[PDB]
Ligand binder design. Structure first.
Ligand SMILES: [Cu+2]
Length: 816
């Protein structure tokens, strides 16, 4: 509602454009947030609707020099498939190969001394003083390479220079231009003065420069294309053709028609043949079959479906033909939500990437200044203190002046210094790692969103769990119905009917179960009439009930906890106080029923704790994070469920009114708190907390309050979410370390500091060491794909030996 616009940008290649655009839009008044992702090439800027409009944003962006447009809906694979870049770089490398092989052959022919040479290396035979035939060949071929292979770099550098920015191709164009002009000048000088010896020229590096540059830029796109595998596979899974059928009266198909997805709407009925994908979500009408969503949620066992159940678009039918009633069509399909969440996850950049952008925005000028300083200091030391350099240049050759060797060495070390820096290794250190991590998470059911929770996941000290929906299954079952008052005037059928018709009014999870039990075991599907239904959450419900003879032919309602009776002026006896005590010790909550001020009896409610609840909490405790439990039920149930799980401190009797203060009090110490709720029920608590985990949410992954979503209703994915996130955060540090050692070692080696040792690099040897740098960063990120999902026997393997039992004695509770 605040003009949250997302723009797609075409032509953004380097890692400094992100910083440039971010700063340019941030410094403009009316805009406070600016995040654009290099990998997705999409921007996310929020602006005030009244001050400026999207037209101003697009004109500003096109003033910067990049084509911008509104984000599309259907087509997204061509941005991340990298096909165009791969084809272009393959063509460029193959084109440049024809001019690099002859240079390599000529260079190597000078290298090996022949045992019996035909004329003992006469390929440097002079024809006109100052110019050898080898130098003529090098000059001509390098001129052709420069006028043919450097066109793209020249164009890109010219486009970048139109603005105040400095980019990567500036380094390449500077290196090539200097290595060309210096050699051309020295050749002209030598030929003009009729020098007897042809000086050595830098006419061989650009042909060897471009081959390695193109090879590196092709291999790194090839490695990048493997980072977007998960998203591409998810996108290319939804069907397009729907077999819509028309039901006359008794599901009879009058005709068969084929309609595309963009035209089909809710309310239509579609038919699926065996081996065909489910096109749309909906409800199963008739027919029993099985379907697999291994590529949707990541499960392995093929689930069985029966009429009256739901389907997920993308799954493949196995047995027979089934007709379903379409409910979700288009962008609201679960797969579309998953795709949207994964795409938007690479938008909220962490601060570490912000520093990496600030440093990479000022890297090229730093390299240029270092190169100029190196050249100047080498000239100064040559023409001031000749002793240091002659100690390592001890051969005075009559064919070359002593100034000439100093000038050549200075220029060589000032070229290879700026031809060895790799800003790309800095730029794509974080995006590749985070995107591979998010993809491999999404392939396993975990749906981590946003880049901030990635490095936020490293520093949780305590994690918060909610009782219902997360530890327990969520489907309560009644154990037994107990009666305390009169039996004649209050028969079991009467109380069953009145409780059922009173609980039918509300939508409480236990109310549905108790109504189903009453209706089933009583034998009638009818119900009475309810009025004046008071609904106070966390306390109880009271109502007036009429028409009780419709069920008994085969009234003040007070339902709530212990304090509910006390609130309405009802006493609680000592004998009844000992009735629910035994049930609540077994983790079974109880409901008191009282009609007309009479102690009618007791109702038992039991919820089964999941088996995975034992391992996930203990693995987290072993990992080094605290855990606590919060619930709105009584004290005794919280203690009972905690022991069956292994959590010491609990927060019981929490009203659904405040429900946020416990988050604050854990954050008063300064630590970070993450709560594992269920979704729409605990939205205020999740969003306030640093990391909200919405577990057990099927086909409802469109949650804005939480930042970690789990599709499968499995508690082990909570452990796997942090486990996979830590292994992802470590890759940024490793990638950046490899992105700093390379530059801080590559400069001094190319700065000529290692002349006493005797290691000097030719400029072409400085780019072959650059192609190996960019690829090594991406291949390091691709190693995360070698991740096998752990299973139950894997987790319990390291858990053997240390399973400490705990009792209710060592179980703390809240303080007021
Ligand atoms: Cu370069």
């Amino acid at each position: 509602s605040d003009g949250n616009i997302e723009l797609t940008i075409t032509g953004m290649t380097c890692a400094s454009c992100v910083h440039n655009i971010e700063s340019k839009l941030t410094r403009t008044n009316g805009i406070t947030y600016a995040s654009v992702a290099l990998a997705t090439s999409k921007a996310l800027v929020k602006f005030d609707p009244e001050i400026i409009g999207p037209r101003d944003i697009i004109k500003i962006i096109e003033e910067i020099g990049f084509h911008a447009s509104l984000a599309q809906r259907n087509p997204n694979a061509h941005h991340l498939d990298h096909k165009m870049e791969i084809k272009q770089w393959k063509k460029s490398f193959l084109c440049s190969l024809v001019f690099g092989i002859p240079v390599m052959a000529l260079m190597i022919y000078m290298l090996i001394p022949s045992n019996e040479p035909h004329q003992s290396m006469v390929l440097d035979h002079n024809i006109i003083p100052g110019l050898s035939i080898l130098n003529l060949i090098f000059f001509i071929l390098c001129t052709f390479v420069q006028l043919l292979g450097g066109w793209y770099f020249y164009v890109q550098a010219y486009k970048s220079l139109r603005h105040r920015s400095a980019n990567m191709d500036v380094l390449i164009v500077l290196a090539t231009s200097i290595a060309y002009v210096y050699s051309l000048v020295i050749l002209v000088v030598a030929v003009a003065e009729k020098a007897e010896r042809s000086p050595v020229t830098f006419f061989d590096t650009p042909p060897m420069l471009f081959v390695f540059i193109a090879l590196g830029r092709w291999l790194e796109h090839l490695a990048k294309s493997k980072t977007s595998e998960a998203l591409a596979k998810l996108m290319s899974l939804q069907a397009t053709e729907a077999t819509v059928v028309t039901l006359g009266e008794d599901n009879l198909i009058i005709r068969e028609e084929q309609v595309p997805m963009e035209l089909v709407q809710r309310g239509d009925i579609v038919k699926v043949v065996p081996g065909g994908k489910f096109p749309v979500d909906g409800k199963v009408l008739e027919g029993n079959t099985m379907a697999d969503e291994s590529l949707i949620t990541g499960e392995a066992m093929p689930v069985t479906k029966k009429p009256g159940s739901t389907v997920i678009a993308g799954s493949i039918n196995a047995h027979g033909s089934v007709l379903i009633k379409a409910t979700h069509v288009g962008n609201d399909t679960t797969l579309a939500q998953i795709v949207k969440l994964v795409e938007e996850a690479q938008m909220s950049k962490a601060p570490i990437q912000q520093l990496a952008d600030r440093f990479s925005g000022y890297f090229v000028p730093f390299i240029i200044i270092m190169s100029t300083l190196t050249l100047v200091v080498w000239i100064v030391i040559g023409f001031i203190d000749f002793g240091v350099v002659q100690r390592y240049f001890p051969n005075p050759n009559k064919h070359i002046s002593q100034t000439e060797v100093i000038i050549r060495f200075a220029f060589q070390t000032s070229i290879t210094v700026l031809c060895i820096a790799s800003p790309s290794s800095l730029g794509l250190a974080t995006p590749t790692a985070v995107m591979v991590g998010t993809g491999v998470a999404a392939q396993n059911g975990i749906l981590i969103k946003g880049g901030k929770p990635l490095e936020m996941a490293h520093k949780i000290k305590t994690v918060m769990f909610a009782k219902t929906g997360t530890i327990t299954h969520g489907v309560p079952r009644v154990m037994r119905v107990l009666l305390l008052g009169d039996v004649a005037t209050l028969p079991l059928r009467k109380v069953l009917a009145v409780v059922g018709t009173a609980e039918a009014s509300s939508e409480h999870p236990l109310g549905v179960a108790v109504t189903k039990y009453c209706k089933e075991e009583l034998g009638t599907e009818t119900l009475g009439y309810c009025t004046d239904f008071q609904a106070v959450p966390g306390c109880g419900i009271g109502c007036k009930v009429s028409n009780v003879e419709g069920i008994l032919a085969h009234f003040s309602v007070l339902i709530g906890n212990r304090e509910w009776l006390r609130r309405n002026g009802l006493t609680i006896s000592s004998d009844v106080s000992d009735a629910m005590t035994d049930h609540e010790m077994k983790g079974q909550t109880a409901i008191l029923v009282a009609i007309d001020g009479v102690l009618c009896g007791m109702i038992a409610i039991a919820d089964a704790v999941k088996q995975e609840a034992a391992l996930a909490v203990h693995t987290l405790q072993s990992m080094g994070v605290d855990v606590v439990l919060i619930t709105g039920d009584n004290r005794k149930t919280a203690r009972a469920i905690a022991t069956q799980v292994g959590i010491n401190k609990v927060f019981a009797e929490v009203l659904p009114s405040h429900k946020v203060a416990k988050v604050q009090e854990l954050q008063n110490k300064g630590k970070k708190v993450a709560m594992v709720g269920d979704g729409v029920n605990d939205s205020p608590a999740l969003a306030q907390a640093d990391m909200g985990v919405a577990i057990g949410t099927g086909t409802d992954v469109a949650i804005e309050a939480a930042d970690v979503v789990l599709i499968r209703n499995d508690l082990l994915d909570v452990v796997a979410s942090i486990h996979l996130s830590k292994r992802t955060v470590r890759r940024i540090r490793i990638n950046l370390v490899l992105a700093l050692i390379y530059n801080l070692v590559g400069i001094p080696i190319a700065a000529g500091v290692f002349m006493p040792i005797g290691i000097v690099l030719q400029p072409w040897m400085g780019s072959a060491a650059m192609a190996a740098s960019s690829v090594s960063v991406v291949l390091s990120s691709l190693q995360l794909k070698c991740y096998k999902k752990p299973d139950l026997e894997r987790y319990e393997a390291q858990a053997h030996g240390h399973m400490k039992p705990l009792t209710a004695s060592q179980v703390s509770v809240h303080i007021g």
